Amino acid sequence: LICVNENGGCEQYCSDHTGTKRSCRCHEGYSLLADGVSCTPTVEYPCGKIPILEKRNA
Amino acid sequence: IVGGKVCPKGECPWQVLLLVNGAQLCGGTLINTIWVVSAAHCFDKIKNWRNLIAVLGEHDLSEHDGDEQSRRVAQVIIPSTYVPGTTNHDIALLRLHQPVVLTDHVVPLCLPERTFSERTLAFVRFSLVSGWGQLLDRGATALELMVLNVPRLMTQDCLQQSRSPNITEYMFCAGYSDGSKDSCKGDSGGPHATHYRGTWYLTGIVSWGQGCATVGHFGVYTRVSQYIEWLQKLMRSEPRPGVLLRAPFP
Numbered sequence A: 001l002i003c004v005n006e007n008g009g010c011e012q013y014c015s016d017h018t019g020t021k022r023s024c025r026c027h028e029g030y031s032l033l034a035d036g037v038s039c040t041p042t043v044e045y046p047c048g049k050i051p052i053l054e055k056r057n058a
Numbered sequence B: 001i002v003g004g005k006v007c008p009k010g011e012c013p014w015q016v017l018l019l020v021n022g023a024q025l026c027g028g029t030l031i032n033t034i035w036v037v038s039a040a041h042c043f044d045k046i047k048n049w050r051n052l053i054a055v056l057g058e059h060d061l062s063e064h065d066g067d068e069q070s071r072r073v074a075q076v077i078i079p080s081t082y083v084p085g086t087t088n089h090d091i092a093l094l095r096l097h098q099p100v101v102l103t104d105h106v107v108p109l110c111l112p113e114r115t116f117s118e119r120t121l122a123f124v125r126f127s128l129v130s131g132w133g134q135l136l137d138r139g140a141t142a143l144e145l146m147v148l149n150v151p152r153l154m155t156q157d158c159l160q161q162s163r164s165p166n167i168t169e170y171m172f173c174a175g176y177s178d179g180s181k182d183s184c185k186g187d188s189g190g191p192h193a194t195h196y197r198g199t200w201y202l203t204g205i206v207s208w209g210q211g212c213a214t215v216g217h218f219g220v221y222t223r224v225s226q227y228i229e230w231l232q233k234l235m236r237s238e239p240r241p242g243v244l245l246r247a248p249f250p
């Protein structure tokens, strides 16, 4: 997988590595799940999320 | 904002209102608890730097509802390459004197990685622009925070579709050419925010031009992706005396 295509499958940030290697990363206030692509919040108020809406669907 | 709608209270929680001597100056974007991104030109004519205020959690300017948080601006950082009274490199980084407290009504927008922004975000068609700007060209400003969905155009396409402002690599086009929908005077410095897979990111800053919602012309926004590294480095830096700081770019 490559970052330039489909975001490398990453929910957030993507890094290409030597080989057929790819590493996904997450913004501060998020952690990467074991799927190696998904980001989940680790804090109450992560960036780029709208609480009243997040709650609205919680 | 011309031809938009009211942003429901709390749905634009990264939006900043900048005041000078209690008067509306510009918009801004919260990206961390102490950092705000705005537009350089907002500060062209600033006489007394000590009376600059940033307000978070603002919605309706006519009332106080207690969700509002005001902070003095401790630093205004602009790129070396910016020339007052122009549009190129129309970006500013503001350091708040004290952090804002994150709440349901106060949340930062994610500043993306450059690569991510360039490779992915840049291809998301529609993004949101917001502010308390003029509701009309030559009109009165908004009392309630307004928001507008605008589509992004590749610069080549923009130029073709347009009928002046020079579009640099440090800019991009977004909006409509039918004169119905645009950002406007009073909105400058506000966010152009882009959604991707459940999260919102900063992709643009409302710059400026002559008039708003001018037929045959699109909105031109500061291309934030060009500035990520510049911003990041600054955010890691210790404060310096004196409000205004010109910092080399790149």
Ligand SMILES: Nc1ccc2[nH]c(-c3cnn(-c4cccc(CNC(=O)Nc5ccccc5)c4)c3O)cc2n1
Pocket (backbone or CB within 6 Å): B025, B026, B041, B042, B043, B044, B045, B084, B085, B086, B182, B183, B184, B185, B186, B187, B188, B206, B207, B208, B209, B210, B211, B212, B213
């Ligand atoms: N479609 C749109 C979209 C967004 C828009 N924003 C504006 C606009 C106009 N004036 N300001 C403004 C705000 C806050 C401080 C200032 C002071 N700066 C200087 O006076 N510089 C300056 C320097 C040298 C010469 C002349 C001017 C200027 C604006 O944001 C028009 C517009 N149109």
Ligand SMILES: [Ca+2]
Pocket (backbone or CB within 6 Å): B058, B059, B060, B061, B062, B063, B064, B065, B068
């Ligand atoms: Ca209010």
Ligand SMILES: [Cl-]
Pocket (backbone or CB within 6 Å): B070, B071, B072, B097, B098
């Ligand atoms: Cl303060």
Ligand SMILES: [Cl-]
Pocket (backbone or CB within 6 Å): B236, B237, B238
């Ligand atoms: Cl330093």
Ligand SMILES: [Cl-]
Pocket (backbone or CB within 6 Å): B049, B242, B243, B244
């Ligand atoms: Cl000073």
